[PDB]
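SEQUENCE WITH STRUCTURE:
===
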Amino acid sequence: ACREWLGGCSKDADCCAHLECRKKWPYHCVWDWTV
């Protein structure tokens, strides 16, 4: 399973979808339009 928004990201390949791995703690998936 993938981590969604505000879920701890294991990959910057938008993890779930339309996301990315925030390069600042907490390292969790954020929307591309929220970073």
Observations:
- The longest strand covers residues 19-21.
- The chain has one domain: 1-35.
- The two ends are 23 Å apart (CA to CA).
- The CA atoms of residues 18 and 26 lie 18 Å apart.
